[PDB]
DNA sequence: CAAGGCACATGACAACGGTGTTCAGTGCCGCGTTGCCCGATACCCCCTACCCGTAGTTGACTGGCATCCGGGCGCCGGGTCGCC
């Protein structure tokens, strides 16, 4: 029962291709640099800090895009490795 | 014939005889309470074969696993659907 609901929760999400995934990774590194700059104790402009924060949030969104995409692969591997004592 | 003079013994007189006593001291030779001298054993030390925790492994490899019955009865009780 619950696994059916989790597979439903996976539902339909956009699968990832080479161009989409590499663009997402580019946004990820952009956001990582943005939060790096934010974490620096040096004073930064307020609007600049908000720009860095929003790109970091967009990178987080990209992260969840990758994870929600590859839930299907990880459950495939789980099927490969299940039935040996753990749930 | 009576009174006065000499022998032997005699009332006491201490001091020896000999033995068993008073202190008292110190041992004599049987029973006890603690000194040896060791010997062992508990407590520190160093490192090392192994136990246990963590870090990676670049073709790709994108939804499981189901259940499946001959009770059977019987009721309660409520939920959902039907009626209108």
Swiss-Prot record:
Family named by the database record: Belongs to the sigma-70 factor family.
The protein's name in its UniProt record: RNA polymerase principal sigma factor HrdB
Subunit structure: Homotrimer (Potential). interacts transiently with the RNA polymerase core complex. Interacts with RNA polymerase-binding protein RbpA via its sigma-2 region (residues 211-347) in a free form.
Purpose: Sigma factors are initiation factors that promote the attachment of RNA polymerase to specific initiation sites and are then released. This sigma factor is the primary sigma factor during exponential growth. Its activity is stimulated by RbpA.
Renumbered residue ranges of the record's region Binds RNA polymerase-binding protein RbpA: 1-87
Organism: Streptomyces coelicolor (strain ATCC BAA-471 / A3(2) / M145)
